[PDB]
Amino acid sequence: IAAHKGVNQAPVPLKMERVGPHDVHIEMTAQITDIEIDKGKIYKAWTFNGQAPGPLVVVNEGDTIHFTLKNMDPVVPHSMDFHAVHASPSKDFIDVMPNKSGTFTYPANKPGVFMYHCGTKPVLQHIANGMHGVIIVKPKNGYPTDKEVDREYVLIQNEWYKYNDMNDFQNGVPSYVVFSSKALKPGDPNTNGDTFTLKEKPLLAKVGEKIRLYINNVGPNEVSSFHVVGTVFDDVYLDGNPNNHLQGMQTVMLPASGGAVVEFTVTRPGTYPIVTHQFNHAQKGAVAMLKVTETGED
Amino acid sequence: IAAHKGVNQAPVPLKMERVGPHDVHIEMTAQITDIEIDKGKIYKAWTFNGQAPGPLVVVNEGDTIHFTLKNMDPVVPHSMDFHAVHASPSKDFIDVMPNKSGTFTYPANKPGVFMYHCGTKPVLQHIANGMHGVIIVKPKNGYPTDKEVDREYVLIQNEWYKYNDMNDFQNGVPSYVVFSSKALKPGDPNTNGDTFTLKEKPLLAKVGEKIRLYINNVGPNEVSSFHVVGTVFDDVYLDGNPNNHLQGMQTVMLPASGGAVVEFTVTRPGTYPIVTHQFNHAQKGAVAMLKVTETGED
Amino acid sequence: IAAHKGVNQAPVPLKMERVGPHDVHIEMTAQITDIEIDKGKIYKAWTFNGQAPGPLVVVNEGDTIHFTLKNMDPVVPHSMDFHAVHASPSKDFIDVMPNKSGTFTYPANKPGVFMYHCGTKPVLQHIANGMHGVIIVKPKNGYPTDKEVDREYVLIQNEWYKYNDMNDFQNGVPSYVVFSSKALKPGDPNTNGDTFTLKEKPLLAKVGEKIRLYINNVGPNEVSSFHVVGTVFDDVYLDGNPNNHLQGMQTVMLPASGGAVVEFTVTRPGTYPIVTHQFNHAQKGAVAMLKVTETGED
Ligand SMILES: [Cu+2]
Ligand SMILES: [Cu+2]
Ligand SMILES: [Cu+2]
Ligand SMILES: [Cu+2]
Ligand SMILES: [Cu+2]
Ligand SMILES: [Cu+2]
Ligand SMILES: [Cu+2]
Ligand SMILES: [Cu+2]
Ligand SMILES: [Cu+2]
């Protein structure tokens, strides 16, 4: 796209504020930002807020979101679809033109770990170029295992293809498949989907802890066989809904856009890889590390 | 196949009649019929009754089916395998020669949304050329959410490949991935697997309704990440068995031949896309629309 | 690999002995062994004990395993990762050099049907060359349906690619997808992953029996849509954990490394194919047979 040549819009923080006991304002951008998805490989991504996947959004069950998208792309329209919400797609996930803003309001009445993404046709093109992310909706009565959990993180799996190549998006194998982590609390890492950062800077934990991961595989195209090496998931809540309870899973199957809450114990010090067990994808990037130390610090 | 050149056998209605409180006769054909699977693209499909996927069959839990296949293909044998039934495959899903009929009897003792398909070797070839469909077996005690449901439809996902090309069937990406709808009640649409009909003629619903979809992904080869844009599934019954209950799913993972009953609320007027969230497949056809109006009519 | 030219190390039996009420010794080899994966097609596999998938391991919930790997490969390191165990991957699933042995100890505290595999980088390469298998951990209180089960077998699904070809492993479709059976009791078959043995020598059962299969899809790369023709699964326990109970499934979706216990009734004499319903994979080998006779014998 000629109007994207040389464009690299610096990342802009997510803006979010609570405006009532059940109402929350969120402001995001759509912007074009260079991201290093593998060493030496820059992808001029289509993004929310200069991150791909985009920034994490966390709301409470029953919150209505009053969402604004500011479209900083000079030529391509963008839009936002949160899988958390009940909305009219043709009214509420509509396009925002370049250099304009649009505001939409919709409720999040279901707990869980939901994908969000751009909804502009062709949606494959907008998702594959980087316009995906996760919104977590926290359950009003929590999860039955909340009191067991010592530490938590968010992980997202996505693919990257040949740059803005619709033939490859529809017909080709992914060039890279990658994990990123998005921060829940100050001091947590906040990374983009790349083949290396969570290997070189593992997530941290302490010996004996029960870890909860909020996970989503945003695709665009693959499913995920999510596994933490050296442990078994004690409890799994499919899509993060507390009712969809499984126990003792070695691997969690996630559809494209599928989410889960998974919990597992790390019994011994060491580094624990986190993979999709579709090992062609692991080989193409989708391995993150969890470093477990006697103190929980590096 | 030289004997299929120029053959286009007009569709023949499904014949079905109840012959006892727990016994039902069904008569289907195997026939060769041109179907427009994308605009300008005709596939000379191998079909049941001139439809691909084939006609919907609905029976009650505990019904024994006395099934007749009339093979109208001039040269290729065909057969029928219902995933609903308990049967001896080597006795009861055997081949019926060209211009012959065969009758088989077997019970449907499990509720759910089951694939049926031709079972003639190579089964990949017979399924990929179009010989797939769905049989629904209604549960004797219903589903716990029956009283919440306002409106229901049947959707089936399938792929189409290069015509009768066994190399492509085994080794190639699908050319098209498509939804069709099969009628439950008079006035419901009854369509074939194509990239366009359920976009141009959306399924209809009314604002505020709880919709139930009986879904199956018949493949042949892909899995499906089934999602309705702008809602969340309130309840999901995997394979349509009432015991396999999930709640609050954003997306339902279906294996090849996998079925489900899914239910969800449409809160606002508008058009709601229905996709597999494997977006390479959505892009290649697998998007249907649900138009939600204040009255439920167009 | 020049040092593998002409190498064909005869299979070595698994050695296992109980050394306390909750402790079990296991000794395996890593060795390079020719296996006929399709008629006329020899794959010089990387294996445990000269079998691919490797030998079956069965322990009880709560057993600690004291595992020794003897590496008979003349040049490549190997290692062992059991998905059953809680262990430190960087201490306990480490490499054993050629012509050396290594011993690791770790507990199996979760019931189910777990994949095991070599954990040496690149793990895709070691899994795809044949270093995968299953460990079953039997639940302390059994499964609720144990008393209904007449006969049981173990089935494993895997893929084979072009020989030791990392490009094909990461980017190519599988050349073959295959089932094997591993013996639970004397007289049960014990086979390797090939396109033909369980067609030519079906598993046996008797009319009217309830069959339990312990299944795992070890990949490396594909997911599996597991189906037995002519029946419906009465009960399914995902990953073999008794709590993850489903009923009346036509097809069980397994992630890569995913396991299950499935149970189903065979009502009539005949031969019952067992497939992944991803029919491109079935066509490339993944069909096993179950021959059901009036006596249970051939
Ligand atoms: Cu507001
Ligand atoms: Cu966009
Ligand atoms: Cu593993
Ligand atoms: Cu009759
Ligand atoms: Cu046929
Ligand atoms: Cu979506
Ligand atoms: Cu010992
Ligand atoms: Cu190895
Ligand atoms: Cu089938």
From TrEMBL, chains A, B, C:
Cu(2+) 6 binds at residue 38. Cu(2+) 15 binds at residue 165. Cu(2+) 14 binds at residue 152. Cu(2+) 8 binds at residues 78, 118, 126, 131. Cu cation binds at residues 78, 83, 117-118, 126, 131, 277. One of its GO terms (molecular function) is nitrite reductase (NO-forming) activity. This is Copper-containing nitrite reductase. It comes from Geobacillus thermodenitrificans (strain NG80-2).
